[PDB]
Amino acid sequence: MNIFEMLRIDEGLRLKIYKDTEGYYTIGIGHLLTKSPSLNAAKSELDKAIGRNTNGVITKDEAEKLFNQDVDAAVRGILRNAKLKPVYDSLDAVRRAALINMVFQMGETGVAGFTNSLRMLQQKRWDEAAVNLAKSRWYNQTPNRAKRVICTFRTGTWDAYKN
Ligand SMILES: *SC1=NC(C)(C)N(O)C1(C)C
Ligand SMILES: [Cl-]
Ligand SMILES: [K+]
Numbered sequence: 001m002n003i004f005e006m007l008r009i010d011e012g013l014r015l016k017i018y019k020d021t022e023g024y025y026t027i028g029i030g031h032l033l034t035k036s037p038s039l040n041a042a043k044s045e046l047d048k049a050i051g052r053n054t055n056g057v058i059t060k061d062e063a064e065k066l067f068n069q070d071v072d073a074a075v076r077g078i079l080r081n082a083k084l085k086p087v088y089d090s091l092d093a094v095r096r097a098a099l100i101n102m103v104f105q106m107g108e109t110g111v112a113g114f115t116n117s118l119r120m121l122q123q124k125r126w127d128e129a130a131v132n133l134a135k136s137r138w139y140n141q142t143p144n145r146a147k148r149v150i151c152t153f154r155t156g157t158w159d160a161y162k163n
Pocket of ligand 1: 150151152154155159160
């Protein structure tokens, strides 16, 4: 298991534009296209992202290319953020993946707002961090995924993603 396999499980793979859990146009492996309700706007974003006039459909290779860029972007968002970088640096590689996962789903600014959870993670108070992370819109709106991510912070193992 690794961050790519983890997010591929949490995000799925769909080759045509679809709406994500928040109702936003998305494609591939959780590649958010736009928060606009305009499908035409989402299609324009897709063409710009892929570099060709699509029909709203991409190939698996193209989905994986966006996915690699998006994982990279999540890590760079962490490393450039003054609140997220110290927490990331303090974590083992398994829990680093859990933090990347959160930033992939919610963005750098959103995760950086989890001030008290971040402090508990940096303190390595894993059960307390788990309780605090669940008191969130994130947990309430995507509880199964949030439970997998929180369990990964709790244990530092991949048990929530095996079988
Ligand atoms: S969270 C969670 N997942 C498993 C089943 C590995 N656990 O033992 C916890 C920590 C309750
Ligand atoms: Cl709490
Ligand atoms: K998804």
